[PDB]
Paper text:
To our knowledge, the best known system that exemplifies this paradigm is the antibiotic agrocin 84, which penetrates into the cytoplasm of the bacterial pathogen Agrobacterium tumefaciens strain C58 by hijacking the PBP called AccA and its cognate transporter. AccA also plays a key-role in the importation of the characteristic plant tumour-derived compounds such as the opines agrocinopines A and B discovered in 1981 in crown gall tumour tissue. The mature AccA structure is a monomer of 493 residues composed of two lobes, each formed by a central β-sheet flanked by α-helices. We identified the pyranose-2-phosphate-like moiety shared by these two ligands as the key recognition template for AccA.
Numbering used by the authors: 32 to 521
Amino acid sequence: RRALRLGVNGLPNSLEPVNAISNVGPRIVNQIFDTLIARDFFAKGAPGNAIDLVPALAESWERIDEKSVRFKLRQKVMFHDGVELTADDVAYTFSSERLWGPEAIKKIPLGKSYSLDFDEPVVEDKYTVTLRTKTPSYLIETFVASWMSRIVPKEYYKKLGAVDFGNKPVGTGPYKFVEFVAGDRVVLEANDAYWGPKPTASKITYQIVAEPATRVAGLISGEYDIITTLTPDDIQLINSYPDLETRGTLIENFHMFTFNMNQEVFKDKKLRRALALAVNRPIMVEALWKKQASIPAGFNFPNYGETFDPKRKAMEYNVEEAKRLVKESGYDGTPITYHTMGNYYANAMPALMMMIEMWKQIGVNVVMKTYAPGSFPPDNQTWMRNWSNGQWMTDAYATIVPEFGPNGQVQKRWGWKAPAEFNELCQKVTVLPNGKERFDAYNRMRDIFEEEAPAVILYQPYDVYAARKDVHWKPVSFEMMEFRNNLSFG
Ligand SMILES: O=P(O)(O)O[C@@H]1[C@@H](O)[C@H](O)[C@@H](CO)O[C@@H]1O
């Protein structure tokens, strides 16, 4: 078997699966671990975007009532160290201790905020576990198929602790941990004792190549088999090589910019809204994305299913109103920093430079401030920054509630003083089953989100990879790389 060499935009600071949640962690942690339920992106000849859910670590499951789901586990699955997976490991994964309780916040900072209102799991037998919520939740199934739900080994994880575990992970996945050189590379090797499809690569390397031009040259020189996070501008040249090709797809994520609302200039919604109203998304999508990116109608995406609003109007663009808001605001002309980690996000700097021009036309002076990985300054030294949100559930709950909700980081850390009505609606949508009331509540939340502008949605990126034609692998419609029944050579 051939070793797979990947040229990547960045790496997570931990391989602990919840802590690894980002654009860069899942492509690694998806290899090391498994979930109870998994998504088959290639079902019924779909081009890596199928919504179909299939058994994975759980052979079957059944919803018992409004707050519990019973899982029948696959038997004789082994973790990479030979330990057998049991309901004990699954209960530990979803426990107060490890994940959502007061004692978990120090280890998994976003565990509680991103989790459901969990009750302790119930182990019925070695291969049967019930996952429950304290209050009604119809989101258990989608949560369990998500990146929040990779199953960790209880004894090994408790032995090392979440920090050391993140540096030496043990999972049930098709690839096992070899090395992690902080801010440089991750090496994984084939897990030949895997319960599912046998791994097709002997090894996988994720080498950070921060600069996309250098990443592109690395594939050209034969240093890499697949490279990530390219832009539509790289397409024509890469495809000019008979041996190389680009592979891309729209993904279930949106790029955005957001604010440090603890800062005086951003405490009020006025300048936040003025900056949002001056963002000409069609020109950015045309110029930087070659029309391949998509512009959603608010915090509203098709993967939400029953809570997607297909009749929703496009987000407003109004330069004259934006000019009036700047004039009425307390803004003096003082430069406002916008923190970006080079091109961690595809088109980060070209998108920012276009917006700086749009903002200059409305009377706002925005200045780019570059930071290297691990050098994001203290919160109070930041004003604007770019970010992204992966839409990780088959429901509108994510990411508006975990990120922007009353218990979330945009309010708690970043100082968004959300209107009381917004927080009231977040609590309602959490417990309600699908219906008119829940549907309408999400629309009112979308309306408040656009009015308040705690963040400004740019677009869904067209995720561009490039690969050698002799490396058969298809991208999926999510911020990760799938190799199960999707990697072969020659
Ligand atoms: O944009 P990033 O690469 O920094 O990572 C974000 C997370 O921070 C976020 O938790 C998640 C869900 O909304 O979406 C992304 O994965």
